[PDB]
Amino acid sequence: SGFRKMAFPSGKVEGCMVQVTCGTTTLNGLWLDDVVYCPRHVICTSEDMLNPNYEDLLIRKSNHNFLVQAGNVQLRVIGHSMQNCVLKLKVDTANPKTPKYKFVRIQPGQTFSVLACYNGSPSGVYQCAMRPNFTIKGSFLNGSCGSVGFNIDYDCVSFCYMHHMELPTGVHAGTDLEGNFYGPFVDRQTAQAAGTDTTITVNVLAWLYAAVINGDRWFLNRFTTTLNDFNLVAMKYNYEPLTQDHVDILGPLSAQTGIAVLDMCASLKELLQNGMNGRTILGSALLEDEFTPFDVVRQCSGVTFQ
Amino acid sequence: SGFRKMAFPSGKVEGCMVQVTCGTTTLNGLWLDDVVYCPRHVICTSEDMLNPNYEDLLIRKSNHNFLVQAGNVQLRVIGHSMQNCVLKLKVDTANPKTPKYKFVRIQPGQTFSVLACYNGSPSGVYQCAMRPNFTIKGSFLNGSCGSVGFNIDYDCVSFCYMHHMELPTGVHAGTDLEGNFYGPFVDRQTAQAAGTDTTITVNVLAWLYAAVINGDRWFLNRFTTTLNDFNLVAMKYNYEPLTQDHVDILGPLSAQTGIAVLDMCASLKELLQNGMNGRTILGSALLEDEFTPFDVVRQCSGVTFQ
Ligand SMILES: CC(C)NC(=O)c1ccc(C#Cc2ccncc2)cn1
Ligand SMILES: CC(C)NC(=O)c1ccc(C#Cc2ccncc2)cn1
Ligand SMILES: [Cl-]
């Protein structure tokens, strides 16, 4: 029993982390096969970040300008190219620790594990969610750019996030491994503000199912509701609209616990209108929305990865 | 910026996890050098756990009774012995992935990263704290026993916890890697209840310093207090007494932020007496006490591990 914010095992990703240095800028890169992926702002200085022209800046860069280091061994760069907002540094040595992997662009609401790095060395691992406004609430300091977010299913590492920027409000923005930013953010130090931080309704419901599975049932009520009526309350409290797809996705949890999805919605409705009354749910005094129905099932069933 | 519950990189520990099977019982073991460590209740059935005599049960066990498996390769056991509540299965092959490591018995209030496993395969990683009542609030299901808690400093893995039991209240109990239980718990399915779950005061203060560092300052007040007067309030709310040692340990954070430790105590006092008033601190609606002063400094400074 017990429910905890749980990241995937990071061993497979640790072995792909390298340090990329371009001039006076150092950040982390992802070494898969014979290619190193890193944020393209590695080629920028601090003054360049206000208004960079990346195509022009890259003209002054050759293969030997990109210093790639793994441990105390230095990778030979035999080619480089810019794809959207990442650079692909072709090296001459295939990473012997390349795991089975994919590049996946996640949707808002999905979760992933972040391996925060500095100078190509791992610092820690934590669980994140792509917010509806396409930011993430991470823990990143100077030099963390290049750190990746990922998921693991059995033996395949699905890379979905690369860290790029920290917005003036403290939240974080990045790209997929193809260099396309999540949301409307650019790799420029300009005025770009995050939108409304809506709550992932389907994830709160999955987390409430996990609470029931683990003994916390005080929040269960005697009411039910309809998707439309509940969504009227969700709008008021800045909750993402619940769709029939979300209901179907919660089916497995509904069956295991015997609590209809709309019954749980009515319980959530009361919590949004009346609060927690100083109580807690799975050790939290607020409604957690960074557990997917997939995460709850996986943690509550003991899925492993080899 | 941003502060997140952060576990150490688990790659070094993943490579030491094996599966130990004894009869019909399977659990995880820690393979360091040519020795495998696992909970001694692996030799027990479900009916044996009510009142086991481990010395007698082990007489019916030989080396070949202990099935140790790493991946799809099976370790040859050439010796076995019982140390407190763990078994040491001497194998004939030194783990080629043995990291630099130590066995450390942590004190209540200290934190560590847990690598939850099942059948010797990692499932996830999360951060835990040894509670003052010597339990931990983890996420463990059947077959997780053997999963270890650890810390990492640069290249040395300090193993401090091995999972053993889940108490009827949902919290978890285990031993150090020498087989001595934390607290008064035994590896018996008997009536043993956890004590008062006191709050780790020094950790709440470190977490409040981390909030200030990251922009959350609404809780800062105009008052100060003395260690004695604050402890009068700490007793009321079941908070561990704050000692001069705790003050000295918070020194580095006090210097970086310019907020005297006793000033922060007075701010905590108001929070305990008046609550949060529906506000949040670093995304939490309650006072977090599973960050040590050491964790805050490490995450806020970007310490890495190689
Ligand atoms: C205008 C001038 C003063 N610029 C600076 O000095 C400057 C700009 C940006 C950053 C940064 C960063 C970061 C990125 C991702 N995650 C965490 C942190 C540091 N320093
Ligand atoms: C009396 C009889 C019904 N016993 C059982 O079936 C029985 C006892 C104990 C467990 C367990 C466990 C566990 C340990 C550590 N972490 C998580 C879970 C499962 N099953
Ligand atoms: Cl909370």
In contact, B88 and B81? CB cutoff 8 Å? yes
Which backbone phi and psi does B81 adopt, to 5 degrees?
Answer: -160, 155
d(CA B251, CA A68): 38
In contact, A175 and A82? CB cutoff 8 Å? no
Structure tokens at A154: 């059995």
Assign domain A198-301 to its CATH superfamily: main proteinase (3clpro) structure, domain 3 (1.10.1840.10)
d(CA B260, CA B254): 6
User: Hey, do A1-14+100-197 and A15-99 end up sharing a CATH topology, with the first three levels equal?
Assistant: yes
Q: Which fold has domain B1-14+100-197?
A: Thrombin, subunit H (2.40.10)
Residues with CB under 6 A from ligand 1: A 46, 140-142, 144-145, 163, 165-166
Structure tokens at B166: 């889940």
Active site residue B80: no
Nearest chain A residue to B119 by CA distance is: A304
Residues facing A158 on adjacent strands: A102, A151
Q: Give the HSE-up count for residue B260: Cα atoms under 13 Å, Cβ half-sphere.
A: 10
Between the alpha carbon of residue A244 and those of residues A111, A134, B211, the distances in Å are 20, 23, 39
d(CA B120, CA B19): 4
d(CA B75, CA B95): 10
Q: Mutate which of A44, A166, A186 to test ligand 1's pocket (most atoms within 8 Å of Cβ)? A: A166
d(CA A81, CA A79): 7
CA of A46 to the centre of ligand 1 (A): 8
- CA angle, B207 as apex, B136 and B4 as ends, to 5°? 75
d(CA A146, CA A17): 9
d(CA A125, CA A139): 10
d(CA A202, CA A249): 9
Ligand in nearest proximity to the CA of A5: 3
Contact between A123 and B10 using a beta-carbon 8 Å cutoff: no
Catalytic residue among B145, B160, B172, B246: B145
Structure tokens at B253: 């954070």
Task: Name the CA dihedral angle for A217, A223, A228, A234, rounded to a multiple of 10 degrees.
Answer: -40
d(CA B152, CA B136): 19
In contact, A116 and A123? CB cutoff 8 Å? yes
Ligand in nearest proximity to the CA of A280: 3
In contact, B18 and B29? CB cutoff 8 Å? yes
- Computed on alpha carbons and rounded to an integer, the radius of gyration of chain B in Å comes to 21
**Domain boundary assignment for chain A:** 1-14+100-197, 15-99, 198-301
Nearest to A119 by CA among B304, B7, B12, B1: B304
d(CA A221, CA A95): 54
User: What distance lies between CA B267 and its chain's CA centroid?
Assistant: 28
CB under 8 Å to A35, separation ≥6 — which residues?
Answer: A88, A89, A90, A91
Overall CATH class of domain A15-99: mainly beta
d(CA B51, CA A85): 63
Structure tokens at B186: 């035994």
In contact, B15 and A306? CB cutoff 8 Å? no
Residues of chain A positioned with their CB less than 8 A from the CB of B170: 1-2, 214-215
Nearest to A167 by CA among A150, A187, A147, A148: A187
Q: Report DSSP letters for B119-172, one per residue.
A: TTEEEEEEEEE--TTS-B-----TT-BTBEEEEEETTEEEEEEEEEEE-TTS-E
d(CA A298, CA B59): 39
d(CA A85, CA A80): 13
Resolution in Å, one decimal, please. 2.1
